[PDB]
């Protein structure tokens, strides 16, 4: 079942790496060396978000695993992941993104909604964090009552993004990371 698969995906943890280094950058992928010596093989299936970082540049990872991490021999640890590579620029001070949540029409307060100190996040990362808040604190995917809905971001400059809580994120058509200090509102509704 597919509400169960959404729950397992969005209620599990994510890998957050800082100042990892690009080893290779092919079409559709990146090969990165993390500061703990793990290697990340990351898939990028969208022609609208094709990371352009060159060999030896520093990147941040906020991403999810597509299958079980494995050891080689030597014994190098390899992570298989999807999306979620950005630059390393930081904001001066961490900020709370402006999330408001509703569950069947009613305002639901947040708990453990973290601050971010990065300038940009992939949309796929905004997806999994918005939905993590929903699955952990507000019941998304955990009863028949609460299995679909949406979130929608709105920027200072008018533009928007939305995802449908009833379905997987659209990795295939993901758009470039955005500046999070220019997010005007995020609204999420469970239905």
């Amino acid at each position: 079942d597919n509400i169960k698969d959404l729950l397992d995906w969005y209620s599990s943890g994510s890998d957050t790496f800082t100042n990892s280094e690009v080893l290779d950058n092919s079409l559709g992928s990146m090969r990165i060396k993390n500061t703990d010596g793990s290697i990340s093989l990351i898939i990028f299936p969208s022609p609208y978000y094709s990371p352009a970082f060159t060999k030896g540049e520093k990147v941040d990872l906020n991403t999810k695993r597509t299958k079980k991490s494995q050891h080689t021999s030597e014994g190098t640890y390899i992570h298989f992941q999807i999306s979620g590579v950005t630059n390393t620029e930081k904001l001066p001070t961490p900020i709370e993104l402006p999330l408001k949540v509703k569950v069947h029409g009613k305002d639901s307060p947040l708990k453990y909604w973290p601050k971010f100190d990065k300038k940009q996040l992939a949309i796929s990362t905004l997806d999994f964090e918005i939905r993590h808040q929903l699955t952990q604190i507000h019941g998304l995917y955990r009863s028949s009552d609460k299995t679909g809905g949406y979130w929608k971001i709105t920027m200072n400059d008018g533009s928007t993004y939305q995802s449908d809580l009833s379905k997987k994120f659209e990795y295939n058509t993901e758009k470039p990371p955005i500046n999070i200090d220019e997010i005007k509102t995020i609204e999420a509704e469970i239905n």
Binding site: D8, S11, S12, G13, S14, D15, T16, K64, R65, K68, S69, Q70, Y77, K111, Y112, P114, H132, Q136, I137, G139, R142
Partner: protein
């Protein structure tokens, strides 16, 4: 057939990040679990080697990092810990569907 949990006791000031290790001493472990007891026993997360942990209702992934890179060890880290996170934490592991439990860790945050 026994699991260890170090440290058994932690006392730290708000904002400190705490690491607790859970180990298989004399057997081949697969899944490990992390619980928390309110003086009852609440499952927080389940963790398989190589994958990211799965978190139960009420538990936020980045407050409770879990690392689990070998069949023998898993590490919970309560990141930026705050007084309300004070309590008793217990780990267990399955063997290769019986759980074997660690002695636990008493945590005090001030």
């Amino acid at each position: 057939a026994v699991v260890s949990q170090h440290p058994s006791r932690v006392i730290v000031k708000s904002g400190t990040s705490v690491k607790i290790e859970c180990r298989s001493l004399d057997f081949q472990a697969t899944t490990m679990f992390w619980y928390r007891q309110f003086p009852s026993l609440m499952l927080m997360a389940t963790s398989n080697e190589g994958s990211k942990a799965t978190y139960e209702q009420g538990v936020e992934k980045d407050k409770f990092l879990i690392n689990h890179a070998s069949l023998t060890l898993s590490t919970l880290t309560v990141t930026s810990a705050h007084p309300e996170d004070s309590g008793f934490y217990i780990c267990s592991a399955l063997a290769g569907d019986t759980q074997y439990f660690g002695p636990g860790t008493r945590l005090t945050v001030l």
